[PDB]
């Protein structure tokens, strides 16, 4: 080391510079963090998008079903819709715990 101190420092700083340029050049060099953030946000996006599905019920807007049908049949209709949303949220939670 003491035979090559200045050379070591020079190489070190040139390496710092090449790191600067390599990072600032392309986005996909930093890939793991982008992978994790995209996976989480995309899973959450699928979760929130799932609310648009009627799951076999009359519609997806719950308030529309409340306005349309009577409680003695809104019972079964909302039962189907809630069990569907519950299943979707449950699989989301399990995959969230996996990650």
């Amino acid at each position: 080391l003491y035979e090559n101190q200045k050379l070591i420092a020079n190489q070190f700083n040139s390496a710092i510079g090449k790191i600067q340029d390599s990072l600032s050049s392309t986005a996909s060099a930093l890939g793991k963090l982008q992978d994790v953030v995209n996976q989480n946000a995309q899973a959450l996006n699928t979760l929130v998008k799932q609310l648009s599905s009627n799951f076999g019920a009359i519609s997806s807007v719950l308030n529309d079903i409340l306005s349309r049908l009577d409680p003695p049949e809104a019972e079964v209709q909302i039962d189907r819709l809630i069990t569907g949303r519950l299943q979707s949220l449950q699989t989301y939670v399990t995959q969230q715990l996996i990650r």
Partner: protein, 31 residues
């Protein structure tokens, strides 16, 4: 640090306020 700012502005983070309207907010990170 200098490299840190490159890294911050190179990661794009997320509609987002529409999620808050349906319960599933994002809790703030502690640190």
């Amino acid at each position: 640090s200098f490299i840190e700012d490159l890294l911050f502005n190179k990661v794009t983070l997320a509609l987002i306020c529409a999620q808050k309207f349906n319960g599933l907010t994002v809790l703030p990170p502690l640190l």
